[PDB]
């Protein structure tokens, strides 16, 4: 994370929680093929005795990475699919507030 030369990677990184018990690279690309072209997709796993399913997903263009997640609440039947931006995550995962706000 030191000067952001290149392409910002952080505009074009996207998470997804929600997934299958299997989202393999195909059952993940199934889902991304059907809606939203993704160039780069990394699979979270965890330790066998572990319950992850999250996967990674980097779209080919900075903007369409940006409407997907500006699109209003999007979930999948069956399995829930949930997409997840990196700067919410990052938020939702540090937890912490620097500037006032409502609360």
């Known amino acids: 994370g030191r000067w952001i030369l290149k392409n910002d990677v952080k505009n074009r990184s996207v998470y997804i929680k929600g997934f299958p018990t299997d989202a393999t690279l195909d059952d993940i690309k199934e889902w991304l093929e059907d809606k939203g072209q993704v160039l780069n997709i990394q699979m979270r796993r965890t330790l066998h005795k572990a319950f992850k399913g999250s ?39 540090n937890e912490e507030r620097k500037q006032n706000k409502v609360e």
């Open 55 to 93: 996967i990674f997903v980097v779209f080919d263009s900075i903007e369409s990475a940006k409407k997907f997640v500006e699109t209003p609440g999007q979930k999948y039947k069956e399995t829930d699919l949930l997409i997840l931006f990196k700067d919410d995550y990052f938020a939702k995962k």
